[PDB]
From a paper:
In contrast, in C14 lipids scrambling in 0 Ca2+ is ~30% of that seen in saturating Ca2+ so that if scrambling requires groove opening, we expect that a significant portion of particles would adopt a Ca2+-free open-groove conformation. Analysis of a C14/0 Ca2+ afTMEM16 dataset yields only classes with a closed groove, Cα r.m.s.d. ~0.9 Å to C18/0 Ca2+, the highest of which reached 3.3 Å average resolution. Thus, in 0 Ca2+ changing from C18 to C14 lipids induces a ~8-fold increase in scrambling activity that is not accompanied by a concomitant increase in the probability of opening of the groove. This suggests that the basal, Ca2+ independent activity is due to closed-groove scrambling. In the C14/0 Ca2+ map, thickness at the closed pathway qualitatively approaches that at the open pathway of the C18/Ca2+ map, consistent with enhanced scrambling. In the three datasets for apo afTMEM16 (C18/0 Ca2+, C14/0 Ca2+ and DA/EA in 0.5 mM Ca2+) we could resolve 4–9 lipids per monomer, all localized near the dimer interface in positions closely resembling those seen in C18/Ca2+ structure, supporting the notion that these lipids interact strongly with the protein. No lipids could be resolved near the closed pathway in these structures. In thinner membranes, closed-groove scrambling is enhanced allowing for lipid transport in the absence of Ca2+.
Author numbering:
A (entry chain A), B (entry chain B): 11 to 88, 101 to 258, 266 to 400, 420 to 447, 489 to 594, 603 to 660, 701 to 728
Write the structure that this text describes.
């Protein structure tokens, strides 16, 4: 065994505080970790901090911790290889000591000296599993089980989702390559099939999630976990509270932030249009096409940086709103990231599809300061916003114990893994497919090539580039599925407006634009209901097995358990007297 | 005790079959009822049928039946005064004998001779409770508990729903009387408040249902019950099946039935319009107004009869589709009754609001065979369709053991109670409020007067006019709540189209009609989401009490339960050695 039976290693800083407080905090830390059933070995690894090591002290204490974790589990209503054995020890460290034990928050409150705690990689399993499916291009269910046993299943749902999305992506890739050689752009045949794919993928992954969360034993996780909330009073079985009206008021800061960000990006896009008209009039290039579209390509390449800036602003605003639980914090964060994603990514194309193309005759005289807008302008917007941001990234890509501790010190300085920074890009790609893929039908091919190139890069990052996350116990990919549903809904309006407005070359005839919007959205809702109710009747195998197991358990437990006025109830004291009375009555009445 | 401890009385016919088979069926009936723990006394009550009486044989058998019913309950995951004590005996009679016992289906299969089984009324409780709140006009929670202990809670949810609907109805009554003296008809102020009321009532009753089903102990009832399905094969733990594709095909008979019913009622309404134009041209009356609108009032009074005819056709079509469970049967029946309700009730007003008023100049020359259509024509349509159908009904309304058995024989010939025939009328009233109440704002007053007149008539009918239903264990009012939600959604489009088309007197300007439809529907969805998410944070008392009880039970049960490589884990065998090693390391590093 490479790791010397180490489960978790707990980093403990001392450089902030002075000397004689650090020994008191260290003594109460080790006293908590030994009061709960954990063994501890401290040896320093950093110049500024020494980290302790934590394993299960004995088999009886480990079985007690496993039984307590299972009791909290099946009271809330929700060992194995490594996920269960590391999850019960992370609960043993972190769970707030009214239950479970030892109540260690990572760095926030009363525990500001201890830094992040983290398990250790198993480099044999990681290297063999990384080089095993370097030539597979499609993982299997046993393979997702091998990524579930390590890393937990919060990683398992993310990897299963990315593999299922990559498998469903090659139907619009083949279709939008077939509908590009044959029948051009802005086509009803491609638009109806694209909206059907956007419905079917979400309504199929919503079923695959239930199947996968019945296969793995994490069926329903609504066990909410507290976080570093800053309570002002102490209401009273005591708990710190925070009123729902001050959070309501603080949540109204999202409206001026989103309005000002939309106004600023509209100013940037209008500046780019003005510079484009300037280089269109003033001759500046022998090729003249790529040089007249220089600022669009520059801002399309620069959009990830301003998106990351707005992500840090939204993260600080989300920390200001002071959520009590972690589920509501993640929901609010995903909503703010969705708003920033919309404003940054789809507004430079909505702003030129519905404002600048049709109103070119009234905005070109307003933007031609210091003295021909086709739908090809919109098609080149979609090209430069779904191609160049990845072309630029690829072009920047091409250009004794002394051996164990020196890799523990190397793992302790790595960064921390997240799912959201790699799943936001999935949400952006699905928005580009849902909203205005009928403009240029090679958007699914341009996304399939990028996903096929960066297929194993996320697994490489989760193995060797960042430290191992503690095995979480997720049930869904999160609120991103609700974001995908909303994004498909907006796409069924946007794509059907664009197809009416730009196919076959005049007068827009609004009495027909709004009728197309109305009928296409209310056809989307009906088709989504039909696909959802059809897929709810086809049952995947890993939930049928659990339903059959639960029915057999119920049937066995039920087969175990089963194996004055009174002058009325004395005439027929049994069965045979009632039978002969009925015999006499039928013979008398039928005779 | 008036009823001589009789729980259920089981009617058994013999006039269909001959003599010597009836004694065999009677003997196996009494053998089943005595094999399960029930006492039986048979005495004849009809000329054509003799019915047995059923009570619990002993206290040990009654406690065994109660424990078996509770075991099936809390295995499916879902005594008292009369509801529990009669429910366990109805399960003891009916439950299909693989569990529970005695497997008696009422009249369908293998048991065609036995007619409907039924409990007996308690006339003291019924008369005292009927004359107690003859002067109350608003029932209390203890009062709904007294209607829950008798009659079960499938009656309790219906009575609580009708009382809550009557309490919420007097806000649009007072508002539409206030908005009628002041600001006329087709008004935005009344339309926005009417749509807000239609949202708030449904999103408040959806919360009151959870509160009431936590107060009563019927939290989640998804325990599906089989019915008289006609299986063709015997698949194999054996069960008869029916393929989901033959039911799918049989369910496509609803489309030609609804299309032909809509075409027939459109023909009737066009005939009424032609006769109205005929009496408008040919002078026939000194008053001339009521005489020119004679056929509208005649068909508006006749609509309940053709609606009942279409209900029998829809019931036969629903029996043709051969559903396996009773929940899916009730859902499909409620959907067909909703379609018939729409076609019969709101199509004669949609057909004159969106076809005949605006297209009067192109349809009056087509309907004036044998040789002025204002919005007042639409207002008089709404008046004659929401007033005269109840005025006609009110005008037709104004113009030893020998004593116990002679009332058991009287109760055995009564009809059978249902909820659907009195809840369909609620759904029709809510549709008239949701869709086109802005046309004539005294529609809520005309409904409030009718409900206040017929307030206690349903309780009178459930006591003395029909026999007592067995105590069912419902959880919701049913699919009618989903029908009310769909009906409010259609109303937010219809009312906002009518208000644009008919307020302040020309050119319709479609680019504005469809924009009003779009913005009003997507404002309805946002306001419904906001009201639903706001009401999900205000917790009613009877579910907070159950949450506190379950949390205290979990806390008590959790406080009960808690009260080479190895040369690494030998340097510090305990806590004090790790403490002094950490002390030496901090003093060496900080020195
Ligand atoms: C093979 C399809 C039928 C044969 C065909 O190609 O004709 C189409 C017409 O059909 C049509 O619109 C009618 C297509 C009806 C869509 C039905 C598909 C539902 C599939 C589930 C062309 O029209 P489309 O838009 O390609 O012009 C694109 C271009 O002209 C504008 O950039
Ligand atoms: C509008 C109603 C404004 C009343 C706001 C409540 C008035 C009290 C208030 O200002 O709340 C402060 C938070 O800042 C707020 O939420 C005020 C947010 C103002 C942003 C709303 C403008 C957008 C309107 C579209 C308290 O914060 P603190 O630090 O004291 O703890
Ligand atoms: C400009 C407008 C500025 C923005 C104003 C207010 C912030 C929006 C607050 C939205 C509150 C609703 C947020 C929310 O929870 O929606 C969930 C899914 O939708 C989501 O994930 C994301 C939907 C958020 C919609 C906001 C789109 C902004 C578009 C602006 C472009 C201009 C539903 O999940 P559930 O399980 O409850 O069902
Ligand atoms: C959906 C079904 C839609 C129902 C009725 C459409 C009503 C439009 C009738 C008016 C059509 C009048 C017309 O001919 O317009 C021309 C373009 O034609 C056209 O490309 C007409 C084509 C417009 C139809 C667009 C279909 C939307 C595709 C479905 C979306 C996903 C649905 C969800 C499916 C799961 C002018 O063009 P322009 O140069 O002036 O600019
Ligand atoms: C998705 C939202 C859909 C918004 C679509 C914009 C609706 C604007 C529209 O189509 O109507 C034109 C207005 O022309 C007119 O007569 C002008 C008459 C003056 C009345 C003011 C019209 C302003 C429309 C502002 C819309 C809301 C703002 C945009 C919200 C998305 C009709 O033009 P036409 O003759 O071709 O028929
Ligand atoms: C094609 C016809 C296009 C126009 C149709 C209707 C316009 C007016 C209907 C407005 C009511 C909205 C009807 C609707 O789409 O509801 C959805 C599903 O409902 C349905 O499956 C029932 C569809 C009703 C059929 C629409 C009537 C057409 C006849 C929502 O589902 P959810 O999950 O949100 O709950
Ligand atoms: C007191 C309301 C404001 C004062 C007022 O009465 O003026 C109204 C205008 O306000 C208006 O439309 C604007 C009303 C805005 C609606 C806001 C109510 C939301 C309440 C939550 C009249 O307009 P309304 O339609 O009554 O004409 C009906 C009649 O003329 C046509 O049959
Ligand atoms: C359209 C596809 C038609 C194929 C129908 C399936 C073909 C076989 C069939 O007719 O099914 C019969 C039921 O009647 C059916 O459902 C046929 C229903 C036909 C009504 C559909 C027309 C509406 C189309 C809008 C069997 O019944 P049975 O007694 O043998 O047991
Ligand atoms: C003419 C059209 C002829 C009619 C065609 C087909 C029959 C409609 C089948 C609708 C299938 C959907 C029926 C259904 O289950 O909807 C439930 C609620 O809606 C309902 O209770 C009732 C909605 C039914 C919509 C039909 C309106 C007919 C309008 C016709 C007027 C013309 C949703 O519950 P859930 O929990 O699953 O969410
Ligand atoms: C909702 C907000 C709606 C947003 C934009 C409205 C766009 C319409 C702008 C064009 C208005 C042009 C106009 O003046 O039309 C006249 C009537 O005026 C008017 O009564 C205009 C009034 C129309 C507005 C109707 C409001 C619908 C009420 C909300 C429904 C429930 C929402 C859900 C709330 C919970 C002609 O009349 P006519 O003689 O030619 O016939
Ligand atoms: C809810 C559904 C809403 C349906 C509303 C009906 C939409 C009909 C409409 O408003 O467009 C008029 C068509 O006039 C025209 O140019 C006629 C041009 C010929 C094109 C054919 C138009 C037929 C519209 C059939 C609609 C679908 C059927 C109804 C489905 C509910 C425009 O007239 P205007 O000039 O005043 O601007
Ligand atoms: C006022 C503005 C009027 C026009 C607004 C948007 C038009 C395009 C949006 C089309 C997407 C549909 C947005 C929508 O209404 O979704 C509902 C709730 O979502 C929401 O609470 C989020 C509302 C999104 C805010 C709409 C964007 C306006 C900025 C459904 O809820 P459900 O229960 O069915 O799941």
């Amino acid at each position: 065994q490479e790791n010397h039976h180490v489960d978790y290693v707990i980093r403990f800083n001392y450089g902030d505080i002075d000397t004689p407080e650090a020994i008191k905090k260290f003594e109460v830390l080790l006293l908590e970790l030994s009061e709960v059933g954990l063994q501890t070995e401290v040896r320093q690894g950093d110049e500024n901090s020494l980290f302790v090591f934590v394993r299960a002290a004995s088999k009886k204490k480990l079985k007690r911790a496993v039984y307590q974790s299972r009791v909290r589990d099946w009271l809330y209503g929700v060992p194995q290889s490594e996920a269960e054995r590391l999850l019960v020890i992370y609960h043993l460290i972190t769970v707030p000591k009214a239950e479970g034990g030892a109540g260690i928050t990572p760095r926030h409150g009363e525990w500001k000296n201890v830094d992040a705690i983290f398990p250790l990689h198993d480099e044999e399993t990681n290297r063999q599993c990384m080089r095993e499916w370097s030539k597979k291009t499609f993982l299997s269910t046993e393979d997702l089980d091998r990524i579930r046993n390590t890393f937990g299943e919060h990683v398992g749902f993310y990897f299963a989702f990315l593999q299922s999305y990559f498998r469903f992506l090659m139907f619009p890739a083949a279709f939008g390559f077939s509908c590009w050689l044959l029948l051009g752009s802005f086509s009803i045949i491609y638009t109806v099939v694209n909206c059907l794919w956007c419905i079917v993928f979400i309504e199929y992954w919503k079923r695959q999630e239930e199947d996968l969360s019945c296969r793995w034993q994490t069926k329903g996780v609504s066990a909410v976990h507290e976080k570093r909330a800053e309570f002002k009073p102490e209401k009273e079985e005591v708990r710190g509270v925070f009123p729902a009206t001050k959070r309501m008021y603080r949540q109204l800061l999202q409206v001026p932030f989103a309005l000002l960000a939309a106004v600023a990006l509209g100013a940037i896009i209008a500046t780019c249009f003005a510079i484009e008209i300037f280089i269109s009039e003033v001759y500046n290039g022998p090729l003249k096409g790529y040089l007249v579209f220089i600022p669009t390509i520059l801002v399309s390449a620069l959009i990830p940086t301003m998106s990351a800036v707005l992500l840090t602003v939204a993260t600080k605003l989300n920390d200001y709103e002071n959520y009590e639980t972690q589920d509501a914090y993640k929901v609010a964060l995903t909503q703010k990231i969705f708003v920033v994603n919309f404003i940054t990514s789809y507004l430079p194309i909505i702003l030129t599809a519905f404002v600048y193309v049709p109103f070119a005759s009234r905005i070109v005289p307003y933007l031609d300061v210091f003295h021909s807008i086709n739908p090809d302008r919109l098609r080149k917007q979609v090209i430069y916003f779904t191609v160049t941001a990845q072309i630029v990234g690829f072009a920047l890509e091409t250009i004794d114990e002394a051996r164990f501790l020196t890799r523990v010190r190397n793992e302790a300085e790595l960064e921390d893994y997240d799912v959201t920074d790699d799943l936001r890009e999935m949400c952006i790609q699905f928005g580009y497919l849902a909203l205005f893929s009928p403009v240029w039908p090679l958007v699914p091919v341009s996304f399939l090539i990028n996903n096929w190139v960066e297929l194993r890069s996320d697994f490489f990052k989760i193995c060797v580039e960042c430290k191992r996350p503690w095995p979480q116990r997720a049930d869904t990919i999160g609120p991103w599925l609700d974001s995908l549903g909303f994004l498909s809904w907006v796409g069924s309006i946007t794509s059907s407006a664009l197809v009416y407005m730009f196919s076959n070359g005049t007068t827009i005839r609004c009495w027909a634009l709004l009728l197309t919007i109305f009928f296409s959205e209310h056809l989307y809702l009906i088709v989504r209901y039909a696909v959802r109710s059809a897929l709810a009747k086809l049952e995947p195998p890993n939930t049928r097995r659990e339903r059959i197991e639960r029915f057999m358990m119920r049937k066995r437990y039920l087969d175990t358990v089963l194996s004055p006025t009174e002058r009325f109830w004395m005439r027929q004291r049994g069965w045979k007297e009632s039978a002969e009375v009925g015999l006499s009555l039928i013979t008398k009445a039928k005779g």
